[PDB]
Amino acid sequence: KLRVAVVGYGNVGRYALEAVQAAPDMELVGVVRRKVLAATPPELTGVRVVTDISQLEGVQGALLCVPTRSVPEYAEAMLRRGIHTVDSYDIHGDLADLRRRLDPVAREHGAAAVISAGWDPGTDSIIRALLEFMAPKGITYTNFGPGMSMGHSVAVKAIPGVRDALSMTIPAGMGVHKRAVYVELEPGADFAEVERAIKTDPYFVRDETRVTQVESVSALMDVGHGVVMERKGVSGATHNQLFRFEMRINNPALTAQVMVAALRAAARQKPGCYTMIEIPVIDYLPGDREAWIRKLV
Amino acid sequence: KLRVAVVGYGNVGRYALEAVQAAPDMELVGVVRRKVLAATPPELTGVRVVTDISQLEGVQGALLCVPTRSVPEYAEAMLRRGIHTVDSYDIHGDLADLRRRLDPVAREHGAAAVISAGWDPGTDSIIRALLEFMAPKGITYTNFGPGMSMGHSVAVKAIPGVRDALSMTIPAGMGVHKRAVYVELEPGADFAEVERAIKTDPYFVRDETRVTQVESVSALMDVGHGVVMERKGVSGATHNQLFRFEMRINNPALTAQVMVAALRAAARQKPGCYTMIEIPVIDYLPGDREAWIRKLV
Amino acid sequence: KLRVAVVGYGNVGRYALEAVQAAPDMELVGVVRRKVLAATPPELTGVRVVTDISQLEGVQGALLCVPTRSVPEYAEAMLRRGIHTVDSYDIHGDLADLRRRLDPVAREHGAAAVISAGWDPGTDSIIRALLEFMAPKGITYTNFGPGMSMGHSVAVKAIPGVRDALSMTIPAGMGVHKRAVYVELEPGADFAEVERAIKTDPYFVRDETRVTQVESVSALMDVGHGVVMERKGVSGATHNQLFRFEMRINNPALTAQVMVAALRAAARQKPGCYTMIEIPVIDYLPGDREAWIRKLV
Amino acid sequence: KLRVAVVGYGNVGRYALEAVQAAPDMELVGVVRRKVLAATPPELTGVRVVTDISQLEGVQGALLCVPTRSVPEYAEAMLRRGIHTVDSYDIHGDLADLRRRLDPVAREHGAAAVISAGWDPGTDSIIRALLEFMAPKGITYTNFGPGMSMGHSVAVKAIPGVRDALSMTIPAGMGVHKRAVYVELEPGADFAEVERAIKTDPYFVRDETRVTQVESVSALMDVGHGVVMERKGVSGATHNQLFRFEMRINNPALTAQVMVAALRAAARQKPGCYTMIEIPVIDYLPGDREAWIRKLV
Amino acid sequence: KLRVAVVGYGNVGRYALEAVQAAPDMELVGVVRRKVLAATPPELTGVRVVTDISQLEGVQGALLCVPTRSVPEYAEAMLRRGIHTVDSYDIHGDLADLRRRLDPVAREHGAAAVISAGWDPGTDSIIRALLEFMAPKGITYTNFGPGMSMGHSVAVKAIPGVRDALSMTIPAGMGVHKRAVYVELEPGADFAEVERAIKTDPYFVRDETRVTQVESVSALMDVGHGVVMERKGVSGATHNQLFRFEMRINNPALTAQVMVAALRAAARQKPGCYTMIEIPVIDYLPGDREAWIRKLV
Amino acid sequence: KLRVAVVGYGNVGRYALEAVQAAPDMELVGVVRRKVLAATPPELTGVRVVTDISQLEGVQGALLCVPTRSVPEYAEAMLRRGIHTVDSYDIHGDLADLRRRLDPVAREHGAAAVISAGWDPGTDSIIRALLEFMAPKGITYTNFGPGMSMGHSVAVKAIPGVRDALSMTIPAGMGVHKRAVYVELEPGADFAEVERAIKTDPYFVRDETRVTQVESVSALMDVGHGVVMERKGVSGATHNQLFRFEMRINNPALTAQVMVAALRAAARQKPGCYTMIEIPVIDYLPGDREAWIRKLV
């Protein structure tokens, strides 16, 4: 029923299309791309592809599957048209500001926006909140990898001279990580300059980063990723409460599925902007509540 | 700030008291017990203890730490007084109905009730809900133990002729569980009788149960418990997404802590009755939302 | 490049197509299906689809992605046309016999056939052989699941009255397995008779099998599967040598990828029929040998 | 049976003898040592021990259990006498070159040579090849230890001044390793110079190496070793395929057992030089093929 | 039966009190504190609390739950009074000397002293001793954490300017540890100064230490800790024997419990001073030996 | 220095010989066998083998490596000659009686005896005692396997008609085990009768046992074994204390090494009989105590 459009046909966008088609409560009106070539990708045969969302039926919701750094602008554009929006904006240091920014825009145009709705930020944030209130005193650790960071990869591919890139995240334990970036340079690019731009990027300035040039990125790339979140803390006055959550998943696949759920929820909220911990988890499930209560609680 | 009362001073009740005292946004007005002897238990020295909640300040919320089967009547009594209530009612097949029964009573008295707010039902429910929407197709398994089930223990304890009892839950894998009950009989009691009663209790009727008489239950009892929840499912059209969540904790201590977070949440809801998946996870955290968003998302 | 055709567009066939397309030394000529409807599934847009392999260019090799019980007939058909063939025939009981049956047919038509080339039988077989000669004395245990057995699922779907079916394999440990079948019955079929047919099928008669009728098989089905192969044996006269191999993979995806490698190898062999342990592992890698030796040995 | 001689009665040689004695298809003709003292070690009682392979019956195959840096010369010597040879040459850097060097010598004398046939290089190489074709895209990580590297230990023992030495390999993760060397110095030798020689030896120059002088190497030495080989890759176009192989074994025991199997295979090959991935796995099993197919595939 | 006194009411002291009360063969005569305020802590309601052990019954044994560096003087004082003593003195390099110093003082006053009786030193020592004689050759590694070190915390706490502190121990593997100190400073204190003092404390001088100032230590502190002890060694002439021991426990609670068992043991020894490996493990069990032999051996 | 004899040259006995030769504080005077053939086993060349201990020098201690059921009689024989004795008598239900039986015999002849000194009973008993006093309330689980039980194997080999046997122990979790016995029958034996005798044996009457006839036991036999002992209990009043100990070892190898340590200890005790929990663990280590204190505590 909910009419949706996938914006940005990249990694997450391609899985988003599949997530929307499998969804029992949604309808894929079309796909919004920067350009639409005469050669139609196999999986888009029979799918409406356009350069502007307005040329797409009566779109009520949009999955913003574009680069994180482009999320703010797209989000505002869709919101100003009264279209609910979901994105997986992953900059932890700024998403709280983005929410305050989109809130009024969303409210004034009678729509809802759910930002940072991937697995991290996203579902892992809900997990961190659970662990936070289950054992208030202590420390939580979120260890990523080994795997591909779609966000870091996009930032490297954005560097001039980079034909293609793979940003891998390696867990060093205790919340600390190391990053290995493999770059496929364009003919004429200067490795040293590309290395400088990578390490200077805010995405990379806080972690030990190692850049290596390679002949082929696709030969080394696997979009799989994972996480291990752990907490050793106190329940009331009771110490040594141990919690552990782990995933070994297809990064883009899970992100897109989560984004779909967040949009299902966005369409149920009062106009405004939300992060995933501000929405009752039942709003992420399709259909009436009763059945989910009996099945899950 | 929030004035609270712990109702029922047993296992969970003891930890509930500690959980409330450690919470930054709550004040423990007192403890409600069926009886108050002249001999004051040490941890209660300096704590108001009465047989009726009416003799306690201006109690705004109450943690119902009484037997599961006694929860319905207690919740209705506190609600009819305008007191928010939280309980850890653990009968999965019935809780949905309990929610529908308490909803109107809660609403008509301007109060909010959060039922089944322990770790399972409770937080494990929120977890199951996440796994469900992160990968809509497939199967989720919840394996408990090895550990003590406070609920099953209470049930056995109530049986006539049982001086004390320990109900252990053993994980057989794939969601199947074996139950081992260690019962300490009262002088001159019919074992075969107690045994028969145990096996046919709705709490035991569905699982493979073994009963063994022992000289001392306290010599064998440890209130530790744990869980392993797993899901192998499909995100969109992408198969083999793997998720795993595990806990190894003091059972009653976690439950009491979760109940505390839930009551905090209850005081923030519109009058009515809710299960934990019907509340935004951030309302379980004390204080303003903004800081929690920067820290967790 | 090796001109290749995919026979049977089911689960394995779907991934097989993707496997061939990604292969650097192969060209996908077309797909052979029992029938070709006017409605072209998206992924087959631009792909030649016929009902007889002879209407496909100059096919040199064929991937028999048909039901295991149909493999012998397809293989002979293909072999009699000078086309190398590969299948994932999974009946351990008599695959050795199939090999003896196809050997002369393959030799007399100047073609090679590599049978039972999935992950088990297939790659797991090579692993069992290594374990076997690395520690000649002791016992090997191959534990499957939890996951979907594509072969058992196909067998159940073939029973009259079954609309759709899922056969999951559960590891009981020590090489023992339990099978849980979920069936979506056809309007009118009798559960009891379908259940009897499933339990007595040669695929299930040797394992504790449980059958359950469900409303939706697709809601529970995930094609992921896995294995844990272990061996505690003797090297020479030195006891307690410990080996362990494990996989958590997309079942049909891996099967098809292996079939492509097996076909690559098939084209390099003398005319005849082989199992995977009768072929040097290097023949499964594309291109000249030298590079793989330096990279892998 | 295949008449076999063990060349080099060191660690590997000792287990090699036991491996041959347990082999159903082999006969131990004798052992070749640099010298034969009048004091016969217990285990060699009844075993013919000479200084030149020609004084051994009619030896058809030889296990070169000599230092890796001595292998090329021994292999050629043996091959020039029409004797099939097997070694565990472990220098990954140029074993491919050794193979090209021995190929003609082996072919021109009608004998077969299987080089680098230990567990790594050796069996682990076959495993890396399988992983390679099961999931063509992604990266493989081979993590060693904690344990004793027989090869690095031999190199250290060869340095002037070293009375005895132990070189342990420590897994740092992601294919990275740290090496901890324990040396028992000869009366008078200088630690600083021995330390320098160790650290700059080609065996150690590529890894973070630490050297420590000890009073007794035998007190710390255990020949056990292990490995964890992992791969997260793509099958066809399906990402996140997870594979893991692990062993906890007696290093030299396994090495010698594999060498025996490699020699068994060597005798079945056309004259020439091979690595283990160039030989069908079934040639490593004793006796007719049929039985192994039924038992393993 | 055995009349006991808990000396020092801090972390371990609190649990020591609980440990003594639960022990079947002991009576808690009282608690010795440097000061006794009019405000009686709830758990001490009904417990005799004094500033000198002479004001407590006929104390026969004392648990010295005071800072490690204060243990020597306290032990000598209790011993000179004929009181058996147990402590958890954790300085590994010094304890042997402490044993030689307390031995005569203990003997000349007809008392027994068991030093360093926590879990490490203490029970972990007994464990290391077993692994040592079960496999005499090889190496044992003791990896602590993640968790809080009561000892290191006390040390930091004592530093001038530190209001409160949390010393966490992180396992780097192979016996190496990283230390993370979280310090809550007193108003107007020099961080760089406190930081400098910490890093040079004998407790910290040998390991990689990081110091971080925080607003609240209690918000981060959890007294849980753990350990993983492993040994790969030789039993006789048989290599690769693998042993592994792990604990995940409430640090101060286990220590207090072990100290209780040790004191029980102390009252059973000939006058003098002992470490835990110098006492038959059965003297740590209450009551007659016969039953323990039937139950444990 | 301590002069020792190995009695019974079977599995444990052969490793016992090696354990004694590696021991720094012992001397192997000889081996006592029921018979001594003209053909000397390789490893006994240079070792004195006789049919009666009296023909062995000045034997001060003896390792009784004979069947458990023969231990009582041998133990008494050696003790009556003033020879310390060690055995690995594994019948848990009776060893407590055996101790009371040997005690007076040992004392009257001025010797010491350490019974049930293997790994279980033996070192695992010491482990169980530690866990018992570290957390008094709770339950301990000892899970064996998969592996070979030397004791059960001996009992089956003792059955008339059994040419050779392998008794494997499989862990079913929670202290429960299953037993798989593989028997190689003599020509003429009756499988049914052998099966009856196996299942009737006290060694097998308390566990689910399955007997299978096979052509070769040596083809399936691996003397490796292991254990996982776990405890979830209370330290004082603190619940959920988690402990876990695991071993993957050469069964006979470890048993013999432990027996050697027990004898080293036996020679340090006052005349009498002991189980391993009645001896300070330091007495199991060679040489002066001081060094072990500084190294282990």
Ligand SMILES: NC(=O)c1ccc[n+]([C@@H]2O[C@H](COP(=O)([O-])OP(=O)(O)OC[C@H]3O[C@@H](n4cnc5c(N)ncnc54)[C@H](OP(=O)(O)O)[C@@H]3O)[C@@H](O)[C@H]2O)c1
């Ligand atoms: N858990 C999380 O929160 C989480 C997880 C995974 C991913 N993510 C986020 O997902 C974002 C996208 O990932 P991806 O791998 O799909 O990236 P991608 O493959 O580059 O796809 C982005 C698509 O947006 C469009 N696009 C590219 N550059 C653009 C630009 N500069 N301006 C406007 N549109 C542009 C393109 O689609 P068209 O060519 O069709 O226009 C492009 O294919 C990442 O930045 C990452 O931060 C977050």
Ligand SMILES: NC(=O)c1ccc[n+]([C@@H]2O[C@H](COP(=O)([O-])OP(=O)(O)OC[C@H]3O[C@@H](n4cnc5c(N)ncnc54)[C@H](OP(=O)(O)O)[C@@H]3O)[C@@H](O)[C@H]2O)c1
């Ligand atoms: N490791 C292993 O060795 C291993 C692993 C996985 C799978 N396998 C084998 O793979 C086989 C196929 O699995 P799958 O999941 O791909 O089955 P599937 O999804 O049912 O597809 C089989 C295809 O075979 C073609 N076909 C030809 N004759 C058929 C017939 N008589 N009945 C039904 N279909 C027929 C059909 O394609 P068209 O409609 O296009 O004609 C059908 O879609 C299984 O039987 C299993 O034994 C082996």
Ligand SMILES: NC(=O)c1ccc[n+]([C@@H]2O[C@H](COP(=O)([O-])OP(=O)(O)OC[C@H]3O[C@@H](n4cnc5c(N)ncnc54)[C@H](OP(=O)(O)O)[C@@H]3O)[C@@H](O)[C@H]2O)c1
């Ligand atoms: N996976 C693998 O591929 C793998 C694994 C394990 C070991 N290896 C290889 O095995 C090789 C041997 O290991 P090891 O532990 O058996 O060494 P070792 O204990 O030192 O024995 C080597 C034997 O070689 C003979 N020898 C002939 N020439 C020699 C020389 N020039 N210097 C010293 N000895 C000489 C000696 O026997 P005589 O005294 O009887 O002449 C010596 O005992 C290592 O170099 C290692 O690279 C490979």
Ligand SMILES: NC(=O)c1ccc[n+]([C@@H]2O[C@H](COP(=O)([O-])OP(=O)(O)OC[C@H]3O[C@@H](n4cnc5c(N)ncnc54)[C@H](OP(=O)(O)O)[C@@H]3O)[C@@H](O)[C@H]2O)c1
């Ligand atoms: N496995 C082990 O061996 C192991 C494990 C855990 C802990 N420990 C040891 O336990 C020791 C104590 O730990 P904790 O956490 O209980 O420390 P704590 O919380 O500071 O308690 C020590 C108590 O001793 C008294 N005290 C403090 N400073 C003193 C001083 N300067 N002189 C005399 N008395 C003093 C105080 O009790 P009053 O106020 O009542 O006088 C204080 O509460 C640590 O030093 C650690 O080394 C050893």
Ligand SMILES: NC(=O)c1ccc[n+]([C@@H]2O[C@H](COP(=O)([O-])OP(=O)(O)OC[C@H]3O[C@@H](n4cnc5c(N)ncnc54)[C@H](OP(=O)(O)O)[C@@H]3O)[C@@H](O)[C@H]2O)c1
């Ligand atoms: N943790 C433990 O407590 C533990 C662990 C492992 C083993 N064990 C015990 O070790 C015992 C022996 O194990 P094993 O594998 O060495 O058995 P084994 O291989 O049969 O060796 C026993 C030896 O004693 C002699 N012997 C055999 N039968 C005898 C008889 N009926 N009367 C007198 N002597 C006899 C023989 O030596 P000769 O031919 O040289 O006379 C025989 O080789 C087992 O019963 C088991 O209970 C205990």
Ligand SMILES: N[C@H](CCC[C@H](N)C(=O)O)C(=O)O
């Ligand atoms: N921050 C983690 C997880 C990022 C997940 C998602 N934001 C992505 O871009 O892959 C990383 O560095 O891998």
Ligand SMILES: N[C@H](CCC[C@H](N)C(=O)O)C(=O)O
């Ligand atoms: N009771 C356990 C361990 C026995 C260890 C030792 N007593 C043996 O005979 O192997 C079993 O059934 O395997």
